[PDB]
Coordinates of C-alpha atoms and ligand atoms in Angstrom, one line a residue:
Chain A
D1 CA 0.5 -50.5 49.9
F2 CA 1.8 -52.4 53.0
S3 CA 3.3 -55.3 51.0
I4 CA 6.6 -53.6 50.1
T5 CA 6.8 -52.3 53.7
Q6 CA 6.7 -55.9 55.0
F7 CA 9.2 -57.0 52.3
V8 CA 11.7 -54.3 53.2
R9 CA 11.2 -54.6 56.9
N10 CA 12.0 -58.4 56.8
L11 CA 15.3 -57.5 55.1
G12 CA 16.2 -54.9 57.8
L13 CA 16.2 -52.1 55.3
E14 CA 13.2 -50.1 56.6
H15 CA 15.4 -47.0 56.7
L16 CA 15.1 -47.0 52.9
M17 CA 11.3 -46.8 53.0
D18 CA 11.3 -43.0 52.8
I19 CA 12.9 -43.4 49.3
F20 CA 10.4 -46.0 48.1
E21 CA 7.5 -43.9 49.3
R22 CA 8.7 -40.9 47.3
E23 CA 9.3 -42.8 44.1
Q24 CA 6.0 -44.7 44.4
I25 CA 7.9 -48.0 44.4
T26 CA 5.5 -50.9 45.0
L27 CA 6.4 -54.6 45.2
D28 CA 5.3 -55.2 41.6
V29 CA 7.7 -52.4 40.6
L30 CA 10.5 -53.6 43.0
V31 CA 10.5 -57.1 41.6
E32 CA 11.5 -55.7 38.2
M33 CA 14.4 -53.5 39.3
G34 CA 18.1 -54.4 39.1
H35 CA 21.3 -52.6 40.2
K36 CA 20.9 -49.9 37.6
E37 CA 17.4 -49.0 38.5
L38 CA 18.0 -49.1 42.2
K39 CA 21.0 -46.9 41.8
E40 CA 18.9 -44.4 39.8
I41 CA 16.4 -43.9 42.6
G42 CA 19.1 -43.4 45.2
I43 CA 20.1 -46.8 46.7
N44 CA 23.9 -46.0 46.6
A45 CA 25.4 -48.8 48.7
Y46 CA 26.0 -52.0 46.9
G47 CA 25.1 -54.1 49.9
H48 CA 21.6 -52.6 50.1
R49 CA 20.9 -53.3 46.4
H50 CA 22.3 -56.8 46.8
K51 CA 20.0 -57.5 49.7
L52 CA 17.0 -56.2 47.8
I53 CA 17.8 -58.2 44.7
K54 CA 18.4 -61.4 46.6
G55 CA 15.1 -61.0 48.5
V56 CA 13.3 -60.5 45.2
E57 CA 15.0 -63.7 43.8
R58 CA 13.9 -65.6 46.9
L59 CA 10.3 -64.4 46.6
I60 CA 9.7 -64.8 42.8
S61 CA 11.9 -67.9 42.2
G62 CA 12.1 -69.6 45.6
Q63 CA 8.3 -69.7 45.9
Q64 CA 7.3 -70.2 42.2
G65 CA 4.9 -72.9 43.2
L66 CA 2.7 -70.2 44.8
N67 CA 2.9 -68.0 41.6
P68 CA 3.6 -64.7 43.6
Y69 CA 4.6 -63.1 40.3
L70 CA 1.0 -63.5 39.0
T71 CA -0.8 -62.1 42.1
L72 CA 1.5 -59.2 41.5
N73 CA 1.8 -57.7 38.1
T74 CA -2.0 -58.2 37.5
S75 CA -2.4 -54.5 36.8
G76 CA -2.0 -53.3 33.2
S77 CA -4.1 -56.2 31.8
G78 CA -7.4 -55.6 30.1
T79 CA -8.7 -54.5 26.7
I80 CA -7.9 -51.2 25.0
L81 CA -9.9 -49.9 22.1
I82 CA -8.0 -47.8 19.7
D83 CA -10.1 -45.7 17.3
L84 CA -9.3 -45.7 13.6
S85 CA -9.3 -42.5 11.6
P86 CA -11.6 -42.4 8.6
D87 CA -8.8 -40.8 6.6
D88 CA -6.5 -43.8 7.1
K89 CA -6.4 -46.7 4.6
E90 CA -7.0 -49.3 7.3
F91 CA -10.5 -47.8 8.1
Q92 CA -11.2 -47.5 4.4
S93 CA -10.3 -51.1 3.7
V94 CA -12.4 -52.4 6.6
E95 CA -15.3 -50.3 5.4
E96 CA -14.9 -51.5 1.8
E97 CA -15.0 -55.1 3.0
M98 CA -18.0 -54.3 5.1
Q99 CA -20.0 -52.6 2.3
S100 CA -19.0 -54.8 -0.6
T101 CA -20.0 -58.1 1.0
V102 CA -23.7 -57.2 1.3
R103 CA -26.0 -59.7 -0.5
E104 CA -29.7 -60.4 -1.1
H105 CA -30.8 -63.0 1.4
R106 CA -33.5 -65.7 1.1
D107 CA -35.6 -64.1 3.8
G108 CA -36.9 -60.7 2.9
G109 CA -34.9 -58.9 5.6
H110 CA -36.9 -60.7 8.3
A111 CA -33.8 -61.2 10.5
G112 CA -31.5 -58.4 9.4
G113 CA -33.9 -55.9 7.9
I114 CA -34.1 -54.3 4.5
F115 CA -31.1 -52.3 3.3
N116 CA -28.5 -51.9 0.6
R117 CA -25.6 -50.5 2.5
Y118 CA -24.4 -49.3 5.9
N119 CA -23.5 -46.1 7.6
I120 CA -20.4 -46.8 9.6
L121 CA -20.1 -44.7 12.8
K122 CA -16.7 -45.8 14.0
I123 CA -14.2 -48.7 13.8
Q124 CA -12.0 -49.7 16.7
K125 CA -9.0 -52.0 17.0
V126 CA -9.2 -54.3 20.1
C127 CA -6.0 -54.8 22.0
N128 CA -5.7 -57.4 24.8
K129 CA -2.4 -59.0 25.4
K130 CA -3.6 -62.2 27.2
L131 CA -6.2 -63.0 24.6
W132 CA -3.7 -62.3 21.8
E133 CA -1.2 -64.7 23.4
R134 CA -3.8 -67.4 23.7
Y135 CA -4.7 -66.9 20.1
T136 CA -1.1 -67.0 18.9
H137 CA -0.3 -70.1 20.9
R138 CA -3.3 -71.9 19.5
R139 CA -2.3 -70.8 16.0
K140 CA 1.2 -72.2 16.5
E141 CA -0.3 -75.5 17.7
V142 CA -2.6 -75.6 14.6
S143 CA 0.1 -74.8 12.2
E144 CA 2.5 -77.4 13.7
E145 CA -0.2 -79.6 12.3
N146 CA -1.4 -79.0 8.8
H147 CA 2.1 -78.6 7.3
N148 CA 3.1 -75.3 8.8
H149 CA 0.0 -73.4 7.5
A150 CA -2.5 -71.8 9.9
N151 CA -5.1 -71.1 7.1
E152 CA -5.8 -67.8 8.9
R153 CA -8.7 -65.7 7.6
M154 CA -10.5 -62.5 8.5
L155 CA -14.2 -63.1 9.0
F156 CA -17.3 -61.2 10.3
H157 CA -19.1 -62.2 13.5
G158 CA -22.5 -61.0 14.7
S159 CA -23.7 -61.6 18.2
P160 CA -25.6 -59.8 21.0
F161 CA -22.6 -60.6 23.3
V162 CA -20.0 -58.6 21.5
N163 CA -19.1 -56.6 24.7
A164 CA -18.4 -59.9 26.6
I165 CA -16.4 -61.2 23.7
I166 CA -14.1 -58.2 23.4
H167 CA -13.2 -58.4 27.2
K168 CA -13.2 -62.2 27.8
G169 CA -12.6 -63.6 24.3
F170 CA -14.5 -66.2 22.3
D171 CA -15.7 -69.1 24.4
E172 CA -17.2 -72.4 23.1
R173 CA -18.9 -72.9 26.4
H174 CA -21.5 -70.3 25.4
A175 CA -22.3 -72.2 22.2
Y176 CA -25.1 -74.7 22.1
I177 CA -26.3 -77.6 19.8
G178 CA -29.0 -75.4 18.3
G179 CA -26.6 -74.2 15.5
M180 CA -26.8 -75.5 12.0
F181 CA -23.5 -77.3 12.4
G182 CA -24.0 -77.9 16.1
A183 CA -22.3 -76.3 19.1
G184 CA -19.6 -74.2 17.3
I185 CA -18.9 -70.5 16.9
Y186 CA -20.0 -69.2 13.5
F187 CA -18.3 -66.7 11.2
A188 CA -19.2 -65.5 7.7
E189 CA -17.6 -63.8 4.7
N190 CA -20.7 -61.6 4.3
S191 CA -21.4 -58.7 6.6
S192 CA -25.1 -58.9 5.9
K193 CA -25.0 -62.6 6.8
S194 CA -23.6 -61.8 10.2
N195 CA -26.0 -58.9 10.6
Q196 CA -28.9 -61.4 11.0
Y197 CA -27.4 -62.5 14.4
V198 CA -26.7 -59.1 15.9
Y199 CA -30.0 -59.3 18.0
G200 CA -29.9 -63.1 18.5
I201 CA -30.9 -66.1 16.6
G202 CA -33.2 -65.2 13.7
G203 CA -32.9 -61.6 14.7
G204 CA -34.6 -62.0 18.1
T205 CA -37.1 -59.4 19.0
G206 CA -35.3 -56.5 17.3
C207 CA -33.6 -53.7 19.1
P208 CA -34.4 -53.3 22.8
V209 CA -35.6 -49.8 22.1
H210 CA -38.0 -50.3 19.2
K211 CA -38.5 -54.1 19.2
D212 CA -37.9 -53.7 15.5
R213 CA -35.5 -56.0 13.6
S214 CA -35.2 -53.4 10.8
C215 CA -34.8 -50.4 13.1
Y216 CA -32.8 -47.7 11.2
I217 CA -32.3 -45.6 14.4
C218 CA -30.6 -47.9 16.9
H219 CA -26.9 -48.7 16.5
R220 CA -25.4 -52.1 15.8
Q221 CA -22.1 -53.8 16.4
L222 CA -20.2 -56.4 14.4
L223 CA -16.7 -58.0 15.0
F224 CA -14.1 -58.5 12.3
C225 CA -11.9 -61.3 13.6
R226 CA -8.8 -63.3 12.8
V227 CA -10.0 -66.9 12.6
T228 CA -7.5 -69.8 12.4
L229 CA -9.3 -72.5 10.3
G230 CA -6.5 -75.0 9.9
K231 CA -7.6 -78.1 8.0
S232 CA -11.3 -77.3 7.3
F233 CA -13.9 -80.0 6.6
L234 CA -16.2 -79.2 3.8
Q235 CA -19.9 -79.9 4.4
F236 CA -23.1 -79.2 2.4
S237 CA -25.8 -80.6 4.8
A238 CA -26.7 -79.7 8.4
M239 CA -25.1 -81.6 11.3
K240 CA -25.6 -81.6 15.0
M241 CA -21.9 -81.9 15.7
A242 CA -20.2 -81.0 19.0
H243 CA -16.5 -80.9 17.9
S244 CA -14.6 -80.8 14.6
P245 CA -14.5 -84.0 12.7
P246 CA -11.4 -86.2 13.3
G247 CA -8.3 -84.8 11.7
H248 CA -9.8 -81.3 11.1
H249 CA -9.8 -78.0 13.0
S250 CA -12.9 -76.3 11.6
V251 CA -16.0 -76.8 9.4
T252 CA -17.0 -75.0 6.2
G253 CA -20.6 -74.9 5.1
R254 CA -20.6 -74.5 1.4
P255 CA -23.5 -73.1 -0.7
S256 CA -24.8 -76.0 -2.9
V257 CA -27.7 -76.0 -5.3
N258 CA -30.0 -76.4 -2.2
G259 CA -29.6 -75.5 1.4
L260 CA -27.1 -72.8 2.2
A261 CA -27.2 -69.6 0.1
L262 CA -23.8 -68.3 1.4
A263 CA -20.5 -69.7 2.8
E264 CA -20.3 -70.3 6.5
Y265 CA -17.4 -71.1 8.9
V266 CA -17.6 -72.9 12.2
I267 CA -14.9 -73.3 14.9
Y268 CA -15.3 -75.5 18.0
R269 CA -12.6 -73.8 20.0
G270 CA -12.8 -70.3 21.3
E271 CA -9.0 -69.8 21.3
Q272 CA -8.9 -70.1 17.5
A273 CA -10.4 -66.6 17.0
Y274 CA -9.4 -63.1 18.0
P275 CA -11.8 -60.1 17.6
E276 CA -9.4 -57.7 15.9
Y277 CA -11.9 -54.9 14.9
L278 CA -15.1 -53.7 16.4
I279 CA -17.4 -52.0 13.9
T280 CA -20.3 -49.8 15.0
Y281 CA -22.8 -49.1 12.2
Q282 CA -26.4 -48.5 11.2
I283 CA -28.4 -50.0 8.3
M284 CA -29.7 -47.7 5.6
Chain B
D1 CA 43.2 -64.9 0.6
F2 CA 45.2 -61.6 0.3
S3 CA 42.8 -59.0 1.5
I4 CA 43.3 -59.8 5.1
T5 CA 47.1 -59.4 4.6
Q6 CA 46.7 -56.0 3.0
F7 CA 44.3 -54.9 5.8
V8 CA 46.7 -56.0 8.5
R9 CA 49.8 -54.5 6.8
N10 CA 48.1 -51.1 6.3
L11 CA 47.5 -51.0 10.1
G12 CA 51.2 -51.8 10.8
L13 CA 50.2 -55.1 12.5
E14 CA 51.8 -57.5 10.1
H15 CA 53.5 -59.3 13.0
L16 CA 50.1 -60.6 13.9
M17 CA 49.7 -62.5 10.6
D18 CA 51.0 -65.7 12.0
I19 CA 48.0 -65.8 14.3
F20 CA 45.5 -65.1 11.5
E21 CA 47.0 -67.9 9.4
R22 CA 46.7 -70.4 12.2
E23 CA 43.1 -69.5 13.0
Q24 CA 42.0 -69.2 9.4
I25 CA 40.8 -65.7 10.0
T26 CA 39.7 -64.0 6.7
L27 CA 38.5 -60.4 6.3
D28 CA 34.9 -61.5 6.1
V29 CA 35.4 -63.2 9.5
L30 CA 37.5 -60.3 10.9
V31 CA 34.8 -57.7 10.2
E32 CA 32.5 -59.6 12.6
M33 CA 34.9 -59.9 15.5
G34 CA 35.0 -57.6 18.6
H35 CA 37.2 -57.4 21.6
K36 CA 36.0 -60.7 23.0
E37 CA 36.6 -62.7 19.8
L38 CA 40.0 -61.1 19.2
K39 CA 41.0 -61.8 22.8
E40 CA 39.9 -65.4 22.3
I41 CA 42.3 -66.0 19.4
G42 CA 45.3 -64.6 21.3
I43 CA 45.5 -60.9 20.4
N44 CA 46.2 -59.9 24.0
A45 CA 47.3 -56.3 23.7
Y46 CA 44.5 -53.8 23.9
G47 CA 46.1 -51.4 21.4
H48 CA 46.2 -54.0 18.7
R49 CA 42.6 -54.9 19.2
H50 CA 41.7 -51.2 19.2
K51 CA 43.5 -50.7 15.9
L52 CA 41.9 -53.7 14.3
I53 CA 38.4 -52.7 15.4
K54 CA 38.7 -49.1 14.3
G55 CA 40.1 -50.2 10.9
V56 CA 37.1 -52.5 10.5
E57 CA 34.9 -49.5 11.4
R58 CA 36.6 -47.3 8.9
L59 CA 36.2 -49.9 6.2
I60 CA 32.6 -51.1 6.7
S61 CA 31.1 -47.9 8.0
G62 CA 33.4 -45.3 6.4
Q63 CA 32.8 -46.7 2.9
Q64 CA 29.2 -47.8 3.1
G65 CA 28.5 -46.3 -0.3
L66 CA 30.7 -49.0 -1.9
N67 CA 29.0 -51.7 0.0
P68 CA 32.1 -53.8 1.0
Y69 CA 29.9 -55.8 3.3
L70 CA 27.8 -57.2 0.5
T71 CA 31.1 -58.2 -1.3
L72 CA 32.4 -59.9 1.9
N73 CA 29.2 -61.6 2.9
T74 CA 28.4 -63.4 -0.3
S75 CA 29.4 -66.8 1.2
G76 CA 26.7 -68.6 3.1
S77 CA 23.8 -67.7 0.8
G78 CA 22.1 -70.2 -1.5
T79 CA 19.3 -72.8 -1.2
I80 CA 19.4 -76.0 0.8
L81 CA 16.9 -78.8 0.7
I82 CA 16.0 -80.6 3.9
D83 CA 14.5 -84.1 3.4
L84 CA 11.3 -84.8 5.3
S85 CA 10.9 -88.1 7.1
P86 CA 7.9 -90.2 5.9
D87 CA 7.2 -91.1 9.5
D88 CA 6.8 -87.4 10.4
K89 CA 3.5 -85.5 10.7
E90 CA 4.6 -82.8 8.2
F91 CA 5.3 -85.3 5.5
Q92 CA 2.0 -87.1 6.0
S93 CA 0.1 -83.8 6.0
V94 CA 1.7 -82.7 2.7
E95 CA 1.0 -86.2 1.3
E96 CA -2.7 -86.1 2.4
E97 CA -3.1 -82.6 1.0
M98 CA -1.7 -83.8 -2.4
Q99 CA -3.6 -87.1 -2.6
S100 CA -7.0 -85.9 -1.4
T101 CA -7.1 -83.0 -3.9
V102 CA -7.1 -85.1 -7.0
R103 CA -10.1 -84.6 -9.4
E104 CA -11.2 -85.8 -12.8
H105 CA -10.7 -83.0 -15.3
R106 CA -12.7 -82.0 -18.3
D107 CA -10.1 -83.6 -20.6
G108 CA -9.4 -87.3 -20.3
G109 CA -6.0 -87.0 -18.6
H110 CA -4.6 -85.5 -21.9
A111 CA -2.3 -83.0 -20.2
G112 CA -1.6 -84.6 -16.8
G113 CA -2.2 -88.2 -17.7
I114 CA -4.8 -90.7 -16.4
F115 CA -4.5 -91.7 -12.7
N116 CA -6.2 -91.6 -9.3
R117 CA -3.4 -91.5 -6.8
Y118 CA 0.3 -90.5 -6.5
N119 CA 3.3 -92.4 -5.3
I120 CA 5.2 -89.8 -3.4
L121 CA 9.0 -90.4 -3.4
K122 CA 10.3 -87.6 -1.2
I123 CA 9.3 -84.2 0.1
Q124 CA 11.9 -81.5 0.8
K125 CA 11.8 -78.2 2.6
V126 CA 13.4 -75.4 0.6
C127 CA 15.5 -73.0 2.7
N128 CA 16.9 -69.8 1.2
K129 CA 17.2 -66.7 3.5
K130 CA 17.4 -64.1 0.8
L131 CA 14.2 -65.3 -1.0
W132 CA 12.5 -65.7 2.4
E133 CA 13.3 -62.1 3.4
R134 CA 12.1 -60.8 0.0
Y135 CA 8.8 -62.8 0.5
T136 CA 8.4 -61.6 4.1
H137 CA 8.9 -57.9 3.1
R138 CA 6.3 -58.2 0.4
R139 CA 4.0 -59.9 2.8
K140 CA 4.3 -57.1 5.3
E141 CA 3.7 -54.6 2.5
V142 CA 0.5 -56.3 1.4
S143 CA -0.6 -56.8 5.0
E144 CA -0.2 -53.1 5.7
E145 CA -2.8 -52.7 3.0
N146 CA -5.9 -55.0 3.2
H147 CA -6.5 -54.2 6.9
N148 CA -3.6 -56.1 8.5
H149 CA -4.5 -59.4 6.6
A150 CA -2.1 -61.1 4.2
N151 CA -4.7 -63.7 3.1
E152 CA -1.9 -66.3 2.8
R153 CA -2.7 -69.6 1.2
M154 CA -0.8 -72.8 0.5
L155 CA -1.1 -73.7 -3.2
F156 CA 0.4 -76.1 -5.8
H157 CA 2.6 -74.9 -8.6
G158 CA 3.8 -76.9 -11.6
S159 CA 6.2 -75.9 -14.4
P160 CA 9.2 -77.3 -16.2
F161 CA 11.3 -74.6 -14.4
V162 CA 11.0 -75.6 -10.8
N163 CA 14.7 -76.0 -10.5
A164 CA 15.3 -72.4 -11.4
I165 CA 12.5 -71.4 -9.0
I166 CA 14.0 -73.0 -6.0
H167 CA 17.2 -71.1 -6.5
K168 CA 16.1 -67.7 -7.8
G169 CA 12.5 -67.7 -6.6
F170 CA 9.4 -66.9 -8.5
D171 CA 9.9 -64.2 -11.2
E172 CA 7.2 -62.4 -13.2
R173 CA 9.6 -61.6 -16.0
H174 CA 9.2 -65.2 -17.2
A175 CA 5.4 -64.8 -17.4
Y176 CA 3.7 -63.9 -20.7
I177 CA 0.3 -62.9 -21.9
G178 CA -0.4 -66.4 -23.3
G179 CA -2.0 -67.4 -20.0
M180 CA -5.8 -67.3 -19.5
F181 CA -5.5 -64.5 -17.0
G182 CA -2.6 -62.7 -18.6
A183 CA 1.1 -62.6 -17.7
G184 CA 1.0 -63.9 -14.2
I185 CA 2.2 -66.9 -12.1
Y186 CA -0.6 -69.4 -11.7
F187 CA -1.4 -71.6 -8.7
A188 CA -4.1 -74.2 -8.0
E189 CA -5.8 -75.7 -4.9
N190 CA -6.0 -79.1 -6.7
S191 CA -2.8 -81.1 -7.2
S192 CA -4.0 -82.7 -10.4
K193 CA -4.5 -79.4 -12.1
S194 CA -0.9 -78.2 -11.4
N195 CA 0.3 -81.6 -12.5
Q196 CA -0.9 -80.8 -16.0
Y197 CA 1.7 -78.0 -16.4
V198 CA 4.8 -79.9 -15.1
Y199 CA 6.0 -80.5 -18.7
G200 CA 4.6 -77.3 -20.1
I201 CA 1.3 -75.8 -21.2
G202 CA -1.1 -78.7 -22.1
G203 CA 1.6 -81.1 -20.9
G204 CA 4.1 -80.0 -23.5
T205 CA 5.6 -83.0 -25.4
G206 CA 5.5 -85.3 -22.3
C207 CA 8.5 -86.7 -20.5
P208 CA 11.8 -86.4 -22.2
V209 CA 12.6 -90.1 -22.1
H210 CA 9.3 -91.2 -23.8
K211 CA 7.6 -88.0 -25.0
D212 CA 4.6 -89.5 -23.1
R213 CA 2.3 -87.2 -21.1
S214 CA 0.8 -90.2 -19.2
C215 CA 4.2 -91.7 -18.4
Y216 CA 4.0 -93.8 -15.2
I217 CA 7.7 -94.3 -14.9
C218 CA 9.6 -91.0 -14.8
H219 CA 9.7 -88.7 -11.8
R220 CA 7.6 -85.6 -11.7
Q221 CA 8.1 -82.5 -9.5
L222 CA 5.6 -80.0 -8.0
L223 CA 6.0 -77.1 -5.6
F224 CA 3.8 -76.5 -2.6
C225 CA 4.1 -72.8 -1.9
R226 CA 3.0 -70.0 0.4
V227 CA 1.1 -67.5 -1.7
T228 CA 0.1 -64.0 -0.5
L229 CA -3.2 -63.1 -2.1
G230 CA -4.2 -60.0 -0.2
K231 CA -7.4 -58.5 -1.6
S232 CA -8.2 -60.9 -4.4
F233 CA -10.3 -59.9 -7.4
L234 CA -12.9 -62.6 -8.3
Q235 CA -13.2 -63.5 -12.0
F236 CA -15.4 -65.9 -13.9
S237 CA -14.2 -65.5 -17.5
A238 CA -10.8 -65.0 -19.2
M239 CA -9.5 -61.5 -19.6
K240 CA -5.8 -60.8 -20.2
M241 CA -3.8 -58.6 -17.9
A242 CA -0.3 -57.3 -17.3
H243 CA -0.8 -56.6 -13.6
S244 CA -3.5 -57.0 -11.0
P245 CA -6.6 -54.7 -11.2
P246 CA -6.4 -51.4 -9.2
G247 CA -6.8 -51.9 -5.5
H248 CA -6.1 -55.6 -5.6
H249 CA -3.1 -57.9 -5.2
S250 CA -4.2 -61.1 -7.0
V251 CA -6.9 -62.7 -9.2
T252 CA -9.1 -65.7 -8.2
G253 CA -10.6 -67.5 -11.1
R254 CA -13.8 -69.2 -9.9
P255 CA -15.8 -72.1 -11.2
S256 CA -18.9 -71.0 -13.2
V257 CA -21.3 -72.1 -15.8
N258 CA -19.6 -71.9 -19.2
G259 CA -16.4 -70.9 -17.3
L260 CA -13.7 -72.6 -15.2
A261 CA -14.1 -76.1 -13.9
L262 CA -11.7 -75.7 -10.9
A263 CA -10.5 -72.7 -8.9
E264 CA -7.3 -70.9 -9.9
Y265 CA -5.1 -68.2 -8.4
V266 CA -2.9 -65.7 -10.2
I267 CA -0.3 -63.3 -8.9
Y268 CA 1.6 -60.7 -10.9
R269 CA 4.6 -60.0 -8.7
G270 CA 7.1 -62.8 -8.1
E271 CA 7.9 -61.9 -4.5
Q272 CA 4.3 -62.7 -3.4
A273 CA 5.0 -66.5 -3.5
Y274 CA 7.6 -68.7 -1.7
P275 CA 8.3 -72.4 -2.7
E276 CA 8.3 -73.9 0.7
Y277 CA 8.0 -77.6 -0.2
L278 CA 9.4 -79.5 -3.2
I279 CA 7.5 -82.7 -3.9
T280 CA 8.6 -85.4 -6.4
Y281 CA 6.2 -88.3 -7.2
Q282 CA 5.2 -91.0 -9.7
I283 CA 1.8 -91.2 -11.4
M284 CA 0.1 -94.4 -10.5
Ligands
ZN301 ZN1 -34.8 -49.0 17.8
ZN302 ZN1 8.8 -91.0 -19.0

């Protein structure tokens, strides 16, 4: 509140403050205004606008080493969830992908429970500008390699930390070597495959409210994410691997005659995935 | 040649012709010039520039139904080939993708010849703005369906008509029901499979110079193309088609017992593929 007051006072233009107070002009707003905008709010004299613009230039550009522009302008960031309408084709296609990828697992519903299909409560698009910029920059880097192709896919992700993911993004620092391909972040083509990890590894102890892994009452959350796989390394046997193998950007576990029953995808960099859709559902 | 003269004479500005002759200004160039550009070439009077600009507006905007702009802007279109440097990362990535995807087929190199590695002579980027905009518009159309996911792959294509493809683009009107999945354009993830079709189905009659399908001497050509698959219908046995099945944008033929040996992809609309790279090579 007092920052713009100091800024204007240093210029000797405090007599303009009664305008800035009425238009709710803060310093983060002032740093984005030129001659046109300043004339709109009532700064009529050219000299006053010139002084204000030169002060803004001296602050933002003259002291860029301090990044004053980033201590300002912080507001407006964050995650917005936009609810899809069941009558739209986007919701219907997401639900079709969710339902049609269910499969019979080797374990008798021990981790994910027993069901044939889902009841989808709502689907939301996740919008976060900083996370999206991180993802697109990494995608550009990966596609500069691998002959101008990002090998981008849309894959399911199940975790008890979905809320943290949709606000801070994917992070490989939360992965550990206990995984089947090591310390990477895992994704699957099958929604039922990801449903096993919603309550932790191996299903954990079930829902917090029933302690039941097949609880048909408590809600569940999955993510449907854009994953940049780049040049993927195909593997059929388990590895305790910390990073992608040399020359590759991801690992693909393939279902052979023995071992894996379904395809699996692993990325060792959090910036290579973006959680586009958040799906809330129950198992039938 | 003469159109600029008629345009200038109709405005009563024929005395300006000597300038337009010196500066090689044609009508297609004139329609793109404003006050700044006209002032640059020495048309100093405001009235003359005003008359020229309003005449251009009356022509291009006043007769939009006859599309004079399309007639004037024909020049500059067409394909160009940009040679890749063997020392560049892109060339090496394409070469590795081609070499590492060689497989031994069910036949003993009857269609594509007998070999284990390629001798890549050159790789060329194909640039054509019209075809690129067509492909990008189709990609946006498909992405609006299939929950904001194009499902874009990089795949190999081989045919005796690549020269027509790089200038006119992929065209489904040349496809016929004789294919195993009907009248579509076929792509493969394995270079050696696409190599089988360079001279025609089953290798045709071999290279023109020798009529030899396993010729090690004559140059062969393949395309490495962006293919938009969207929602792909999985298939394991042959069934003929004129178009993709309802709700789907492409067909994926999968390996199976008594079925295919290697994966195949089929599209039924030409604008869903773009021939990004042209590769020419020798069979070793
Ligand atoms: Zn419960
Ligand atoms: Zn030959």
